[PDB]
RNA sequence: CAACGAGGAAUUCCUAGUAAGCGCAAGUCAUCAGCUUGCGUUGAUUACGUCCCUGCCCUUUGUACACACCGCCCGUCGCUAGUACCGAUUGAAUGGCUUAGUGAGGCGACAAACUUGGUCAUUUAGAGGAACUAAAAGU
């Protein structure tokens, strides 16, 4: 409670995935992307993504799980995309795929984020009526 | 896949897919989830 | 209607609270049932009864139980009494005037400690309700709410400003930042309970369930997480039961400081603590013996640093204490006792010997009290009053001074009454004794050994009062004569059952008496003939009346039912259902055929015999009501209670749209304001800096609810819904369309909340250029076209950028479960 | 030297062969002739939108299978279970202390068992009071 209202993620981080407190997680995860995204290869601060790095095999399979069952949501999938990237870019790969227990959970979140890359996309496509516009705007003249 | 019930009895996931757990939540928010699920196990 | 009301209570010395003591010994307030009463320990007169200026019973008394008062406390120097009561509420009274000053509710359930901070105008409240909350008085108002406890508080030390620490009935104890009013370091302090707290500045002593009290060392300065507040080792009393208040004292002339922890039966441990030069010059000694095994015997202090003291006892079950100290020979301690009595105890020292086996009391108040509930109540013709008690503490009250002028000691004595001629009293034991009483004299006229077998419980005069009638548990009424003023047993009626009401009509013509077997019996007194079995109560059945005209008689029981009969057949008239726990005890009138009823769930009823309706609903006891009387002419009727009181009873609208619209205009009012601010100060340095624009003041709402405007205007358009999105932004005209334009180009600059509402910017941005598109494209300005330019990339630039971890996370993921099928499937 | 020249305040009904005008027949076991029901002829004005007002209703897990969209309605009082509290129940009893005698008998000291006041731990037959906490609907 005391890191979660001074700030301090990485060791908030760790305490909630101790304690497993799931909803603290999910916060502590989206203030620190948002942070992230305020400030400016690492994509929460470094401190945290060590944090993330150096945990073991059942912590990171309940932050998978976590993981899973944020990204069934279109609105909190984010967070969860951005913590299986640090997953995937700061672990071993072999030992991701020969953990107990990952491959339910990854054969259920292929498909959630392949419809989320598609809303993406159809968003990134119907963003070009600004360019339309503006094509429209220099022909005025 | 789809968000079922939560698999075991210190944590709930709602099918939104955001999961508390019990000993973490406050008691007004277990009043509230407590409220919620009981006209969601009324209706 | 003539309607009843309450002229005067008392009965009460001390009850279920504490007190507070104030300085010329001194005088003590304490609390009476719901108001609160001073005494002199000097003398003992009641010099106060400080109470609520409406009396309960009156035409606005509310339909419940009155707020029983639960914690007294004092401010001594600028002179108020904050007193706070069992439902929550907090009356601050200034003690000149008597007053009622302030009303501070708050609360949900009933409190449990207050004090008063930084001495004036501050006042700190815990309750049975896990919250403390703090209470300003120079503004009326609850400041701030410390909540993070879970079961009721116990106790908390506060010191101004910065550090309160709580502790309450879980096995936590909590510090509070009040600055921020959010929880620091907590602790779980005994594995029960945690009933008591008392620091003197270095350390800290608490107490829970059985006989541990744990020392603490609170450092305030202290910076680590878990360590503000440490703990340094637990010692043992003799009392095995809760100890319940700790409290501190640093006498003066030499320094020296002293702490008592009361217990919940009988017994206040009083502690010496010692000072820092016998600690240095005992540390060695048991350090003796010349380092692990000395440092583990070093370690484990308390009774090192702590010296128990004159273990003061009492009679009764200790409630709460509190003390004044002069020359360290004077430790002068006022004790309220459970039973009501408060006892001024002072326990001397010599600075080395305590000079006494035990310790001394000084003075006793408790000549106002009975020590037990009064198990019978009567009346004189009007002038004096009856109590009976089971200590033996019969007592005669006058009405009209409210003073016990004569007292006796009887034994567990149930049920009594006075003799026609007044000044004289009968009355009759728990066990099988009778014994008679007057007021002139001393206290035994006689008493009858072996009156009945067993337990006696009803009698009662003729009304010439010189025959009597006693019902006992031995299954057996006696008759007996007053011969000359001694009792003659004549004859005895044995029946099947156990007899436990008596009663005989007041015009000597019938004998009405209720066995333990649901039934009463009628009877003539003139042949023991057995006129009536009145029948059908189904439940063993207390107190009957008989009505002046000796027609009507009622029948109380625990079945929560009193039943109206005629005597004339023994036919039933109503069974009128009262009194959700049990009706003790049912009087008439004298001339009339109304009557009241008090029960055993702390409320009198009034009630009348011809339309059986209830006249009024009594509400000013707190707990059984065992006993009522009624005056034998005019009618007042006295009751008599459980919780040691007697008192008696006299006559006398936007929409989505529009929302957004206004959000809209002065979130970019205040935003170009801001940038008009920001080209002044550019201008006004890079030019000759002589003058500049004064000062933009932010906005009343948005610094009211603590917003950028990007947020202000981000949190109206979430909180339009999806349905009526569509036309909420197609209400909005062009020049709102711009202006929502200006917005977008400055929220995605702040790069946090571009990211956490980047679909819903893009669903309203393209919906509103969709739409608007025929005239934003006929616009001709270059600050929109650079705009549009500058919302096109960052936009997009946010979403590649989502959409290239999606992708990663696709291609990742599939590459781990395909390696994971090519390894084993 | 009485009434009256399209009827005040209020109020009711009404959306296409409808409102209204017009006549002609019948008189169908109830009803109707102080009238009722048919039948044709002539035939419009204005709404055909809206929940702003007045009300009435419905829902508040999306479930029903994809795609897409959404992304925890709220509060009070009750019910159930637990945890400690407040005393009254001569609580009563056990056990140990301790109140003072009766003390058979072993060996006139000594004295196991019986009466008889307070101290400590526990049960309440149980019944009250008024607190706090917990509570699970998902092929």
Redesign the interface.
């Known amino acids: 409670?005391?890191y979660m209202?001074k700030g301090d993620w990485t060791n908030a981080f760790l305490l909630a995935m101790t304690?497993?407190?799931?909803?603290?997680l999910?916060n502590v995860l989206?203030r620190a992307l948002?942070?992230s995204?305020?400030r400016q290869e690492v994509?929460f601060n470094e401190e945290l993504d060590q944090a993330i790095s150096i945990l073991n095999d059942e912590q990171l399979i309940l932050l998978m799980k976590?993981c899973?069952?944020?990204?069934?949501?279109?609105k909190?999938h984010?967070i969860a995309?951005?913590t299986?990237?640090c997953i995937?870019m700061h672990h071993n790969?072999?030992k991701?795929?020969?953990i107990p227990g990952?491959?339910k959970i990854?054969?259920?979140?292929?498909?959630?984020?392949?419809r989320?890359?598609t809303?993406?996309?159809n968003?990134?496509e119907?963003?070009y009526?600004?360019?339309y516009?503006?094509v429209?705007?220099?022909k005025?003249? | 896949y789809n968000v079922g019930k939560a698999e075991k009895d210190g944590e709930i996931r709602l099918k939104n897919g955001v999961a508390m757990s019990k000993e973490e939540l406050t008691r007004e928010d277990k009043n509230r989830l407590r409220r919620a699920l009981k006209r969601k196990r009324s209706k | 209607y003539q309607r009843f009301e309450q002229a005067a209570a008392f009965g009460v010395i001390a009850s279920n609270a504490n007190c507070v003591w104030i300085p010329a010994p001194g005088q003590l307030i304490t609390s009476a049932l719901e108001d609160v009463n001073i005494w002199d320990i000097k003398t003992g007169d009641l010099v106060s009864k400080l109470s609520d200026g409406l009396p309960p019973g009156a035409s606005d008394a509310r339909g419940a139980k009155p707020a029983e008062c639960t914690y007294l406390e004092a401010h001594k120097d600028t002179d108020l009494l904050a007193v706070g009561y069992a439902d929550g509420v907090i009356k601050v009274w200034d003690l000149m005037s008597k007053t009622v000053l302030l009303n501070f509710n708050g609360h949900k359930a009933a409190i449990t400690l207050l004090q008063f901070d930084g001495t004036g105008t501050r006042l700190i409240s815990g309750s049975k309700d896990s919250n403390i909350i703090v209470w300003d008085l120079v503004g009326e108002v609850g400041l701030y709410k410390l909540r993070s406890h879970k079961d009721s508080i116990t106790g908390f030390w506060c010191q101004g400003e910065d550090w309160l620490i709580s502790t309450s009935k879980d096995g936590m104890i909590k510090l509070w930042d009040l600055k921020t009013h959010q929880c620091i370091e907590t602790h779980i302090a005994h594995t029960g309970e945690c009933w008591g707290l008392a620091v003197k500045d270095d350390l800290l002593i608490t107490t829970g369930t059985d006989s541990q009290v744990k020392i603490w060392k609170l450092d305030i300065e202290n910076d680590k997480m878990g360590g503000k507040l440490t703990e340094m080792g637990i010692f043992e009393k003799q009392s095995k039961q809760r100890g319940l208040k700790i409290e501190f004292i640093t006498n003066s002339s030499d320094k020296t400081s002293f702490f008592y922890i009361q217990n919940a039966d009988k017994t206040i441990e009083t502690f010496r603590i010692r000072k820092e030069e016998e600690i240095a010059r005992g540390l060695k000694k048991r350090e003796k013996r010349l380092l692990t095994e000395e440092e583990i015997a070093k370690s484990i202090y308390s009774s090192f640093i702590l010296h128990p003291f004159q273990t003061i006892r009492s009679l009764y079950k200790i409630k709460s204490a509190s003390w004044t100290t002069v020359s360290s020979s004077k430790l002068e301690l006022v004790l309220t006792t459970s039973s009501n009595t408060i006892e001024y105890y002072s326990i001397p020292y010599e600075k080395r010997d305590p000079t006494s086996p035990a310790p001394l009391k000084t003075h006793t108040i408790e000549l106002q009290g009975q020590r037990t509930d009064v198990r019978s109540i009567d009346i004189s013709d009007d002038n004096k009053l009856l109590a009976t008690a089971s200590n033996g503490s019969l007592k005669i009250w006058n009405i009209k001074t409210h003073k016990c002028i004569r007292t006796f000691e009887c034994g567990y004595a149930l049920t009594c009454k006075f003799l026609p001629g007044g000044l004289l009293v009968i009355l009759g034991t728990r066990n099988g004794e009778l014994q008679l009483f007057d007021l002139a004299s001393s206290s035994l006229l006689d008493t009858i050994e072996d009156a009945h077998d067993a337990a006696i419980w009803s009698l009662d005069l003729t009304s010439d009062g010189k025959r009597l009638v006693t019902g006992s548990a031995d299954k057996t009424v006696k008759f007996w004569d007053f011969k000359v003023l001694k009792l003659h047993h004549d004859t005895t009626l044995e029946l099947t059952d156990d007899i436990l009401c008596v009663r005989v009509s007041p015009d000597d013509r019938y004998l009405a008496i209720s066995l333990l077997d649901n039934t009463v019996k009628v009877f003539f007194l003139d042949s023991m003939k057995f006129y009536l079995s009145l029948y059908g109560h189904k439940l063993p059945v207390l107190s009957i009346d008989i009505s002046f005209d000796s027609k009507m008689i009622i029948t109380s029981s625990a079945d929560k039912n009193i039943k109206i009969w005629g005597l004339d057949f023994g036919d039933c008239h109503k069974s009128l259902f009262a009194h959700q726990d049990s009706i003790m005890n049912v009087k008439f009138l004298p001339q009339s055929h109304n009557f009241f009823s008090c029960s055993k769930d702390a409320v009198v009823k009034y009630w009348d015999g011809e339309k059986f309706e209830c006249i009024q609903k009594l509400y000013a006891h707190q707990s059984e009501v065992w006993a009522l009387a009624v005056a034998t002419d005019g009618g007042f009727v006295v009751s008599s209670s459980h919780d040691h009181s007697i008192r008696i009873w006299e006559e006398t609208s936007l929409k989505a749209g529009e929302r957004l619209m206004e959000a809209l205009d002065l979130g970019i009012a205040e935003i170009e304001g801001l940038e008009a601010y920001n080209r002044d100060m550019k201008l006004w340095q890079r030019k000759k800096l002589g003058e500049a624009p004064i000062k933009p003041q932010g906005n009343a709402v948005l610094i009211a609810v603590n917003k950028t405007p990007e947020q202000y205007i981000m949190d109206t358009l979430l909180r339009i819904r999806m349905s009526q999105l569509e036309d909420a932004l197609m209400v909005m005209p062009f020049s709102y369309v711009l202006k929502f334009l200006k917005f977008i180009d400055t929220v995605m600059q702040n790069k946090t909340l571009l990211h956490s509402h980047l679909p819903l910017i893009c669903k309203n941005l393209f919906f509103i250029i969709k739409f608007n598109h025929k005239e934003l494209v006929s616009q001709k300005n270059e600050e929109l076209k650079l705009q549009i330019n500058r919302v096109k990339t960052e936009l997009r630039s946010a979403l590649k950028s989502t959409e290239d971890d999606l992708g990663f996370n696709v291609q990742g993921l599939k590459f781990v479960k395909q390696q994971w099928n090519l390894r084993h499937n």
């Open positions: 409670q005391n209202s304690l497993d407190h799931p909803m603290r999910f989206k948002g942070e995204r305020s994509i976590r899973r069952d944020w990204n069934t949501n279109a909190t984010t995309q951005r299986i990237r995937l790969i072999a991701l795929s020969e990952m491959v990854v054969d259920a979140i292929i498909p959630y984020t392949q989320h890359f809303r993406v996309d968003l990134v119907q963003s009526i600004l360019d516009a503006l429209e705007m220099d005025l003249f």
